[PDB]
Amino acid sequence: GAMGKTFKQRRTFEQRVEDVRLIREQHPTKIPVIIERYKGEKQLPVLDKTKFLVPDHVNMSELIKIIRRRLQLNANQAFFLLVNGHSMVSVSTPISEVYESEKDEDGFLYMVYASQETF
Amino acid sequence: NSSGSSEDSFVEIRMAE
């Protein structure tokens, strides 16, 4: 019997804090953010990976386009990104301030995406 | 989970430095 174990299942809480801090040490110029497909996202495809490294000098317009590039998102269809599970950030806000405004207790950043403006 | 190495776990953003 199959079992699709997400990143948090294959990496215990200890391994998670250790991974985040080690990432902050080796890649101090990158922010560890989780990009997960919404549980009801049926139209849009699943992201190839979940752990991303974004430079603090960028904005969401760019991050959105990077995901659109590899996910090969359609032009006739649109989507939104919810931070920690809430869509309240503007596309022009720098990820540096967004990171410290949404930082989790383990120090990781969570993000979920879907093709809908309201859940 | 005996064997374990630094697999591709994180995916950095594409930019121009």
Q: What CATH number is given to the structural domain containing A3?
A: 3.10.20.90
Contacts of A6 (CB under 8 A, 6+ apart): A36, A50
Binary contact (A66, B14; C-beta < 8 A): yes
In A27-117, which ranges are continuous DSSP H helix?
Answer: 60-71, 95-102
Q: Does A58 touch chain B (CB under 8 A)?
A: yes
Domain of residue A24 covers 1-119
**Residues 6+ away with beta carbon under 8 Å from A52:** A32, A33, A34, A35, B10, B11, B12, B13
Q: Which of A4-8's residues contact partners 24+ apart within 8 Å by CB, and which partners?
A: A6/A36, A6/A50, A7/A34, A7/A50, A7/A51
| Distance of alpha carbon A22 from alpha carbon A20, whole angstroms | 6
How many domains, in total, are found in chain A?
Answer: 1
β-partners of residue A51 are: A34, B10
> φ, ψ for residue A56 (rounded to 5)?
-60, -20
> Is A22 part of the contact surface with chain B (CB cutoff 8 Å)?
no
Q: To the nearest whole angstrom, how far is the Cα of B10 from the nearest Cα of chain A?
A: 5
CA-wise closest residue to A30 among B7, B12, B16, B15: B12
Pairing verdict, β A30-37 and A109-114: parallel
Q: Is A99 left (phi over 0), alpha (psi -120 to 50) or beta?
A: alpha
What is d(CA A32, CA B8) in angstroms, rounded to the nearest whole number? 14
Q: What are the chain B neighbours of A32 within 8 Å (beta carbons)?
A: 10
DSSP state of A77: S
Residue type, A71: L
Half-sphere exposure of A115 (CA within 13 A, CB side): 13
Interface test with B, best of A6, A35, A48, A51 (most B CBs within 10 A): A51
Determination approach: NMR
